[PDB]
Structures are given as C-alpha cells and as structure tokens.
C-alpha cells in the first residue's frame, strides 16, 4: 500500500501515513534488488527484523534524481530546506528508486512541483502548503513545477522514520516468541528490551499503563511481559 501505490504526492505537500499494530517483515525491502539508494541512519538494515517500534511513518514523494542526496539528515539545498527537512536525529531508512516509467510523461509532467521561495525555511517535519507569492499579486509565487521526460529522471522516494521509545511497542518484525522461564538467568528479549538475568514474579504494584520500572541509572528492574 505504501510502495505499490500509483500516486506519490508532490514534495511540496508530501504524503504521510502511520503504520501500527502489525508484524512488519522488513526483509522484503532490504533484500530486494530493485531499490537504488538503500540508506539507514541510526539503525542497520539487517537488524530491522529484531526491533519493536512505537510508530512507523512512511512519507512518500517524488523528486529529481540529482536531489536524492538532499534527503538526508543535516544536508542543505532547495529540497532539504524549503520543502522537506529531516532532523539531525535519525530518520530510519530512505529508499528511492528511479521512476521515469510511471511518473515522467511524453512531455513535461508539471504535476509534481516544489517551492523555491519559502521565506523561513521549515523546521523538521513541517508541511507548509501555502501560496503567498514571494515578493520580487504579480511577484513570483513559491511553487515552480518540475518537467520530466539521468539527473532529471523522476525518482520516487519513501522514507521510513521509526518512532522509537514513546510508549509500549506496537510494530514488531517477525520473531517467533518462545514461552518464558523463571529463576534461570536467560538472554531474554521482552518487546525489544534485550538483556540477561533471572526473572521472578513481582509484587510491585504496576498500573495498567506502566510498562516497566527503573530504580536508577537506567537499570530496568521490572517489566510486564507483553502477552
């Protein structure tokens, strides 16, 4: 639904959907030989199967090929400043694949467009779809289209930005859980929390919205199993 879709919004107003409450086989994306630039920040692609995330956002849009380098943390330019800026903190992975077969045209497409005249280049993840005719009524208005027909191949770009550590886990890759044990120190993995130790029943009064506890110094002392 993210990838096969026949319509990628213009980078002026990039689409975004939130994925939740499911199992995400990530291998399909990694081991596919189609994608041109597979780049993961803050996470390594070969490990996406073994993590649990709170939210996963997949923002998708098209762009001129030479600008695929603009979509990266801490880069600057027209696209990275006026249209869609990722924070210095990571975005999970950027996938992009050359797409002049679908979204280019016999002539100039002119549907996909971007602004070159924002006044106050936007903060991380801001979707400014206004039109205020930057000054020279007559003065040049911001969005100027892009015409297609290898630096000007239209490239489709989808960005998976993992929202890590906000709440209980919600999106977890394929990993067959096993039954739990007690009083034997095991290399456990509760919902992504990877550690070792012996597990004992708790008398500690949790609350129905508490996921774990830490006494001090990030020492995860208790945890409620997900099942």
């Amino acid at each position, epitope marked *: 639904e993210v990838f096969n879709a026949t*319509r990628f919004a213009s980078v002026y107003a990039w689409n975004r959907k939130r994925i939740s409450n499911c199992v995400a086989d990530y291998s399909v*994306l990694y081991n*596919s030989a189609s994608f041109s630039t597979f780049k993961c920040y803050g996470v390594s692609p070969t490990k996406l199967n073994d993590l649990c995330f709170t939210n996963v956002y997949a923002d998708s849009f098209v762009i001129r090929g030479d600008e695929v380098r603009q979509i990266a943390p801490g880069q600057t330019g027209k696209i990275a400043d006026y249209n869609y800026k990722l924070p210095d903190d990571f975005t999970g992975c950027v996938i992009a694949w050359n*797409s002049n*077969n679908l979204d280019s*045209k016999v002539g100039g497409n002119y549907n996909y467009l971007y602004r070159l005249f924002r006044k106050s280049n936007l903060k991380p993840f801001e979707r400014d779809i206004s039109t205020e005719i930057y000054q020279a009524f007559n003065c040049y208005f911001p969005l100027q289209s892009y015409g297609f027909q290898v630096g000007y191949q239209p490239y489709r770009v989808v960005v998976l930005s993992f929202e890590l550590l906000h709440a209980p886990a919600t999106v977890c890759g394929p990993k067959k859980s096993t039954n739990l044990v007690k009083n034997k120190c095991v290399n456990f993995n509760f919902n992504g929390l990877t550690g070792t130790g012996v597990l004992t029943e708790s008398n500690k009064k949790f609350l129905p919205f508490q996921q774990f506890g830490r006494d001090i110094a990030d020492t995860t002392d208790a945890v409620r199993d997900p099942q």
Partner: antibody
Amino acid sequence: EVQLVQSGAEVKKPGESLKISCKGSGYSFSNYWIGWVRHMPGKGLEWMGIIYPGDSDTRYSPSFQGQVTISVDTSISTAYLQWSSLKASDTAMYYCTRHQYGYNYGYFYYYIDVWGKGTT
Amino acid sequence: QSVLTQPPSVSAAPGQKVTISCSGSSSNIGNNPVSWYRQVPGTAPKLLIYDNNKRPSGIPDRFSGSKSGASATLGITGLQTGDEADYYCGTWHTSLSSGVFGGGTKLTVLS
C-alpha cells in the same frame, strides 16, 4: 473472476464520431489501469493508450495522440473513447483491457485479459 | 514497419522445439521486460509469457522465453497442432512513454 465486456457489433460511415464502451466486473476497478489496443484483420495489435481510472490520468501513444480521447466513469466502472471523424481504414478489431502497470518494487508491465470486440 | 521487428511466420512438426525471436531498440527492450501473447484466429489474445521467461498459471510449462539485449526469444517444446496461432511480443517503451507491440508471427504446425 474479472470480466470486461464491450458493446456489440458496430458499423458506421466516415464522417462520424464514436464512443465505444467497456465494462469491468469482479475486481477493484478503481485501482487498475485500463486502456485500448487495436488489432486489424490479418494485421497485428497496435498499442493505443491507457488511463488510470482512479484519477483520470492518461498516457497516449504518439501514433494516436489527438486521435482518440479516452475517458472513464468510475461511478459505474466503465471506460470509453471519443473520436472526431471515422476513417474508412478505421475498420479493425479494437480491444479494451486491464493491465498491471505498477512498480511492485522493480517495474513491471502486464496484460491480464481483454475478451472484447469492436469494428467500424 | 513496427518499432519492434518480428518474423512473418515459422513452421515445424509436432514434437519439435521452436524458437522465434522479435527485435526492437534498447530504449525499451533493453531495460523494460518482454511480454508475449498468443491469439488464435477468432479468439481474443491471452497472456502467454510475462515480464521475462515467466508464464501465468494455467499455461503449461512447455513455454519459455529469454530476453537478450534489445531483442527477445519465445520458445516452445512439445509442439502440437492446436498450438497453431499468431504470437506477439510487447512491452512499455520508455522513451516515448507509450508501450508497443511486435508485428506478429504466424506459427503454423506441420501436418
């Protein structure tokens, strides 16, 4: 099971306009491309042009640009063409069909089925 | 005549291994995968071989394909008389953003 059905036997005289019908049934019509291909008697199929039903986006082969303007009605999942002036050599078997045109992850084109008929 | 070039016809006995080939530019075929269809006189064309060397379900394994550079080859084993037909090659052409067909090949069985 998908089916596309076309209008019955058609004959007209040069000087006239046409709008042939194609109906799709048994599949999500508003998510597949639909387009036309002309096969002439004792002659080969010609690729005409297609449209995306969901948003009325069209691709036209240059050998037919301006000739036939092809449109849709997603209200009842039916596509049609439009002409200007039939030519006498327009007598051929036209065809409407649905074809995968997506970009799964690496790009692919397809032809699922036609089962149509048309002449002039 | 057509932006793809095809043979006009072939013929070989039942049981022979027949390979026809249709050629075109590399603006399309070199980068875009080749599709082949079969048409019996009086029967609307059906999908035979897709993106490359691959057949749908319902089509017997006897059919195979192979793309090389800017041309394509369609091969059939265990030929039988009901396999007599016309055979066509097609693929979305990238430059003209259009998509095209070959000319057509008349496969007539010997018998």
